[PDB]
Design a protein around this motif. Structure first.
Motif, mmCIF file in Angstrom:
data_model
loop_
_atom_site.group_PDB
_atom_site.id
_atom_site.type_symbol
_atom_site.label_atom_id
_atom_site.label_comp_id
_atom_site.label_asym_id
_atom_site.label_seq_id
_atom_site.Cartn_x
_atom_site.Cartn_y
_atom_site.Cartn_z
ATOM 1 N N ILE A 1 91.067 -26.672 41.694
ATOM 2 C CA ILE A 1 90.718 -25.277 41.948
ATOM 3 C C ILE A 1 89.338 -25.040 41.339
ATOM 4 O O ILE A 1 89.257 -25.185 40.108
ATOM 5 C CB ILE A 1 91.790 -24.369 41.296
ATOM 6 N N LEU A 2 88.286 -24.830 42.118
ATOM 7 C CA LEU A 2 86.963 -24.671 41.565
ATOM 8 C C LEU A 2 86.729 -23.197 41.180
ATOM 9 O O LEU A 2 86.589 -22.318 42.023
ATOM 10 C CB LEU A 2 85.862 -25.119 42.515
ATOM 11 N N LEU A 3 86.717 -23.014 39.874
ATOM 12 C CA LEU A 3 86.531 -21.691 39.296
ATOM 13 C C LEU A 3 85.071 -21.245 39.277
ATOM 14 O O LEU A 3 84.178 -22.073 39.305
ATOM 15 C CB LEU A 3 87.057 -21.736 37.840
ATOM 16 N N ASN A 4 84.895 -19.943 39.059
ATOM 17 C CA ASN A 4 83.585 -19.335 38.856
ATOM 18 C C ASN A 4 83.716 -18.388 37.664
ATOM 19 O O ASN A 4 84.847 -18.212 37.170
ATOM 20 C CB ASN A 4 83.157 -18.642 40.139
ATOM 21 N N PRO B 1 88.597 -20.322 45.217
ATOM 22 C CA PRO B 1 88.938 -18.899 45.229
ATOM 23 C C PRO B 1 87.720 -17.995 45.266
ATOM 24 O O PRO B 1 86.636 -18.528 45.019
ATOM 25 C CB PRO B 1 89.779 -18.762 43.962
ATOM 26 N N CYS B 2 87.859 -16.704 45.593
ATOM 27 C CA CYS B 2 86.653 -15.853 45.625
ATOM 28 C C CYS B 2 86.275 -15.400 44.216
ATOM 29 O O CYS B 2 86.939 -15.714 43.232
ATOM 30 C CB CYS B 2 86.783 -14.631 46.531
ATOM 31 N N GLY C 1 87.419 -15.781 50.846
ATOM 32 C CA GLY C 1 86.356 -14.789 50.709
ATOM 33 C C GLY C 1 84.968 -15.396 50.718
ATOM 34 O O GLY C 1 84.606 -16.172 51.599
ATOM 35 N N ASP C 2 84.162 -15.093 49.706
ATOM 36 C CA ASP C 2 82.796 -15.556 49.570
ATOM 37 C C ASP C 2 82.666 -17.063 49.356
ATOM 38 O O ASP C 2 81.591 -17.631 49.572
ATOM 39 C CB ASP C 2 82.052 -14.796 48.481
#
Ligand code: HEM
Ligand code: HEM
Lengths: 727, 727
Positions: free
Chosen positions: A579-582, A642-643, A673-674
């Protein structure tokens, strides 16, 4: 001091936890309540540590384990330092010889149980009753490499199972393909010499992609069948949980009435069949050379116990010669379309060992270790294996008392007149060490054969022939099984076979060996031969173009059970998603993602550009498992983005690279989303593509779509698109 | 028979050839005229093959080496097949225990010679005359991994040299960094256990990036110095030819007058210092785990003999206490700014072995093997080493007669009263096996010490102190050497150290260990601690921010000899360049390219999208060495893309990826004519950039520019630019 922390964070929880949640530990400390008769019987030699004083091996407490004894604090070390000398001596003697083949392996404890009594076909006690559970110890391995080589190489894999039955240890020592490369055990040193590192320089490790291997194959066409399996994706399994197992040889089952039935043994992975792709496997040998060892250990700690169904192919004695292949030839498989695999029982691996060396490295399996109800056949490869395991284990494990090493010990009774030998543990009190004897009333005594608890008697096979060193003429056919295998593969599996041969032959320095292998492929299938030849810059001759294809196998032009993927069998429990987080994760997406994964037993790994924690829109503190570079896409089955604040990771090269790699390797990707801005990096359509899940948010059907793709393992339709991406 | 081809292409030429031009082979066949006294003395055990009959080990010719003896061609194998049984038995017993540490290594034969007589400082015979040549055998290794692990791991490397002198074997058993991790030999099993694979599951192989290593480091600050070196690019050398070598310990030289001089041993690479970058090294562990072994072997086959200059740091006996650090402390280096390295001699490695197992795997080196003219000191790590090598070799090599295994034998005379032991080869005719004796007139006899050819006598060092297990207080300083090393590194070297620490600690599962490590880094240098903390999501405390930096080292705030790259020493001979071909290469470019490379001893590898050959514009047939994917940019030092039909490879994803990977790993790239279209892939400006050579054709200055960049090894200015590339 000492400094274990006050929060007790040094010690992992003694309950099932997902991969990466807690440090791994010895099996008996991770899962103290998981037991079986064998695991319990090892209790006499398990050694604890907590609250005990540090001592020499003679029990003397040590006061200072930080310094040698010297004459003055800057003076010479004194010979009388017996503490230093015992400690250094034991360290100096830690290593034993690795196995000759199968030196790289990973093992676990478990249990087996038959689905129903098989007393009509065998008197083997372990298959006599559905409520009789038999403890097992299983070791999986690569085949060529040393014990320090990498797991995800291209190679055959070993799959050895030690059954601790009430009538003796039965070892079922198989591999992950249903045939072997050679026909007679006399050639085993030749074949293994040819595949192992070359003798002058000891290169290469864990690879058949070198001249001597391809020289041998080109001169010994009997190898082509297993070579085909090794060049396919079967040679690069996703995990030991997702490959088949085979005993290879025809053995016999003997019932109480004395009837013999031929049998071939199979293991079916209940997690389904699944393999990597070459580029991924090869890069994973560099990123994580312990991938399969780690994956097995973490599956068991998570409760995702590896499960396998034992299955038997049964052929009546009267049908020995009814096939167009010899049943005793180990280079020939018995097509399931001809002889179905009957389900027989289930094997579950549910506990890791405590000490790898003591339990895995010293385990000794032997195909000779059979029990009443089982017997051998004259397969000439099996016959010579019967001699070799015993011989090698004496030097590997130091003496003839290797059955007294705890992991190797039977759980049932063992009594005989054998004595002495190096490192003798058992202290015999029998007055006699010979039989017949009157002085102990002839005990222990022989036991006649019988329906149960009887002594071992061989089946009285009729033997008629002269003493000859001769290959049976019936074994002299080498191309129809390779062809059958080839035609049973999907188009994308066929491409991967071609790619495997092309890549391997490109590393063969002597061009004429390349040409000779191509000539052999022309005896199997022209499409195969031409595709490999084109990659090698070789042009087939007119004669090669007119070689007649070998005959079908008993009218079969294909058998879909030989393909990894033609018949879907995909299970997702135990798989993992990156899961690539921001830095401003939209927690609505994350909630939905984790709940859907959790419901299907799929694990998640939270990744970021650094370690530590990130905080979601809503204030949720998220702990980071690893960095994008630190745990590459090679180690996961799918990737979700995820966005949130996508600008944070949109200009991150590692984040983009992560998706390019996963895309290239045919793994499902889901963008919310984005996160859909990442579609440019993997250059595909404005309108979308099968294999890429996208929506405004990670909700209802988004996770269902992603999960359906994971059940199919990889996105095979994306193959034609991956060649334009620079990854 | 007749499986060899009639054009004789199976056999490699017996003359120096570039890497990849010919199949590699045993040293004596590849270079029959390369000789030395040791190589000549091994002739008695060298065994040929050609034109001989295949036999058992007892000399019996074998007729059929394809089949076991059975009763009928489909019958059971018979116990009397003594031929099968010898062959399988010997195979079954091939393996021996690997070395406890340094099990992964690659070795070669060569020779040493001193520049001038060193008789004024040492009576060692081998250092007594410039015309005296001493055969050597050198083994380089990694340290943690098994014998089948990968070469380009991050780890210390071993560098062991066996000098076959006229007065005895002297073994100089050193590493590629000037200090070791620990101070006293009693802790060696603890340290080694901590760095090796963890005991419950035996992961990870070849890596210190796991919790037990960092736990130990965090608890034992004496380790930080060597840890700094390991985390730097020193831990990932380009090749064994491009790294330094050190004995580590302070030893003594003893001259004929009996004067003792303290000495530290150094090896300077005449090819210069050069390392990989972490991402490249880790990926190279997957693409070619045998990269250093192969590179060593092929350099010698090409005539690019590895050369090293032996140098001594000499300290007078009366200067023992004049430094801020203790000369006997192996965790402290002696800065070259304080005590210069005096050049002593040159060592050239010019012949590979014939059989890796016989010569490399059985080689036995011991730091206790000294000769008259040398002596030991009380360094407590060295003192305990003296005990360990003898001990471990008896179990590793089967008994006490390992000095009779051919590679280990002295070339000078050896006579004594020792007898028997397993595998005794020498048949002693002396009537006596004891001394004193009269029955053989006391021979062999002791010899007094003297200026030359005398007996060994230890230097009479004064010992004064009580029997104690106590660390000298003078060894209790752990952060000033780490800080000296840190400040001597270039800014890009510093970043690579930060990156190493951050990557490795991100693999430690217990967060507290990561924090403890960061706290130790805050005692070394605040900038270093903050940069690693930032990458781990850790915030230093105000007390951590105020830890005072450790003192300078004897007034030194830096020493450029500790940096790999601060003083250029770049040599290009032996390096390799990838040349990316197209189907209509402009031969003017290729002629200029290859001749320029050839004039400087730089190798070339012609790559394409397939194997075979391509034809240049003027009809020149160009043989393809490997494919883009088959021989990645990881294996080369630079990449040149010649002009021609660029459209042929401009759409090739592998060709682009080849450049992106080479770009990210800071390698020089040169693009000619239409090849400049590839600049968009690596996002370089329209005007150009330093590190990218570009012109209309590959002529005059183009190759001089590229070669200049290759002499600087990597393009360090590009570091800020590589983060935006998804590679
Ligand atoms: C159908 C063919 C074969 C299969 C399926 C097979 C499978 C295996 C497996 C799985 C192991 C490793 C067991 C463990 O995990 O410890 C092994 C080890 C070994 N195999 Fe076999 N093998 C085959 C043929 C042979 C032959 C023909 C020979 C020699 C005649 C042989 C000699 C050995 C030896 C010496 C070992 C090392 C055993 C030890 O050190 O404990 N193998 N084999
Ligand atoms: C300055 C510190 C040390 C250095 C530079 C060093 C270097 C090396 C090297 C290069 C090798 C491999 C030689 C070969 O290529 O075969 C080796 C092997 C070995 N080292 Fe040391 N080592 C050090 C410390 C120690 C200590 C403190 C001990 C134990 C007290 C130790 C025990 C061993 C053992 C048991 C081996 C395997 C020897 C064999 O099997 O032949 N080392 N070391």
């Amino acid at each position: 001091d000492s400094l274990a922390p006050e929060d007790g964070s040094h010690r992992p929880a003694a309950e099932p936890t997902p991969p990466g949640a807690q440090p791994t530990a010895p099996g008996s400390l991770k899962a103290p309540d998981t037991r079986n008769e064998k695991l319990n019987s090892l209790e006499d030699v398990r050694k604890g540590s907590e609250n005990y004083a540090l001592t020499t091996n003679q029990g003397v407490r040590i006061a200072d384990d930080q310094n040698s004894l010297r004459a003055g604090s800057r003076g010479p070390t004194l010979l009388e330092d017996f503490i230093l000398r015992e400690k250094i001596t034991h360290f100096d003697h830690e290593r034993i010889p690795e196995r000759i083949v199968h030196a790289r392996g990973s093992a676990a404890h478990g249990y087996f149980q038959p689905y129903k009594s098989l007393s009509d076909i065998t008197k083997a006690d372990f298959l006599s009753d559905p409520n009789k559970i038999t403890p097992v110890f299983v070791r999986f391995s690569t085949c060529q490499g040393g014990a320090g080589s990498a797991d995800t190489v291209r190679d055959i894999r070993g799959f050895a199972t030690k059954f601790y039955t009430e009538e003796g240890i039965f070892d079922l020592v198989g591999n992950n393909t249903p045939i072997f490369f050679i026909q007679d055990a006399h050639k085993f040193p030749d074949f293994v010499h040819a595949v192992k590192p070359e003798p002058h320089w000891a290169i290469p490790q864990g690879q058949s992609a070198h001249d001597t291997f391809w020289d041998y194959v080109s001169l010994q066409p009997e190898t082509l069948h297993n070579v085909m399996w090794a060049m396919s994706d079967r040679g690069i399994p996703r995990s030991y949980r997702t490959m088949e197992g085979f005993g290879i040889h025809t053995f016999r089952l003997i019932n109480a009435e004395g009837k013999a039935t031929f049998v071939r043994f199979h293991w079916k992975p209940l997690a389904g069949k699944a393999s990597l792709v070459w580029d991924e496997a090869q890069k994973l040998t560099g990123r994580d050379p312990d991938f399969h060892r780690r994956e097995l250990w973490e599956a068991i700690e998570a409760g995702d116990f590896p499960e396998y169904e034992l299955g038997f192919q049964l052929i009546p004695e009267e049908d020995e010669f009814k096939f167009d292949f010899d049943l005793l030839d180990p280079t020939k498989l018995i097509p399931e379309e001809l002889v179905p695999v009957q389900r027989v029982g289930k094997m579950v691996l549910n506990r890791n060992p405590d000490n790898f060396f003591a339990e895995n490295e010293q385990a000794a399996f032997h195909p000779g270790h059979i029990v009443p109800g089982l017997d051998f056949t004259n397969d000439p490869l099996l016959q010579g294996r019967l001699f070799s395991y015993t011989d090698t284990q004496i030097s590997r494990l130091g003496g003839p008392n290797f059955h007294e090493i705890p992991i190797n010990r039977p759980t049932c009774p063992y009594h005989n007149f054998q004595r002495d030998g190096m490192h003798r543990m058992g202290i015999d009190t029998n007055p006699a060490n010979y039989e017949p004897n009157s002085i102990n009333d002839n005990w222990p005594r022989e036991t006649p054969p019988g329906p149960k608890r009887g002594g071992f008697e061989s089946y009285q096979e009729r033997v008629e022939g002269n003493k000859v060193r001769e290959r049976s003429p019936s074994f002299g056919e080498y191309y129809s099984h390779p062809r059958l295998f080839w035609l049973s593969q999907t188009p994308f599996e066929q491409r991967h076979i071609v790619d495997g041969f092309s890549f391997e032959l490109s590393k063969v320095v002597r061009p004429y060996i390349r040409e000779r292998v191509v000539d052999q492929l022309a005896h199997i299938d022209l499409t195969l031969a031409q595709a490999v030849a084109k990659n090698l810059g070789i042009e087939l001759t007119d004669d090669q173009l007119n070689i007649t294809p070998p005959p079908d196998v008993n009218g079969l032009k294909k058998d879909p059970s030989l393909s990894l993927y033609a018949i879907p069998d995909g299970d997702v429990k135990g798989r993992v998603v990156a899961i690539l987080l921001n830095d401003e994760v939209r927690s609505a997406d994350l909630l939905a993602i984790l709940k859907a994964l959790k419901a299907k037993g799929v694990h998640a790994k939270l990744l970021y550009s650094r370690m530590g924690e990130v905080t979601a829109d809503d204030g949720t503190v998220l702990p980071i498992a690893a960095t994008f570079a630190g745990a590459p896409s090679l180690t996961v089955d799918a990737v979700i983005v995820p966005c949130g604040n996508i600008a944070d990771i949109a200009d991150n090269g590692d984040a983009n690279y992560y998706l390019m790699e996963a895309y290239k390797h045919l793994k499902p990707i889901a963008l919310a989303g984005d996160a859909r801005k990442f579609k440019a990096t993997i250059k595909i359509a404005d309108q979308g593509e099968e294999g890429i899940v996208e929506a405004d948010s990670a909700d209802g059907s988004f996770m269902d779509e992603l999960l359906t793709l994971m059940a199919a393992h990889r996105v095979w339709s994306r193959i034609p698109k991956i060649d334009k991406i620079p990854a």
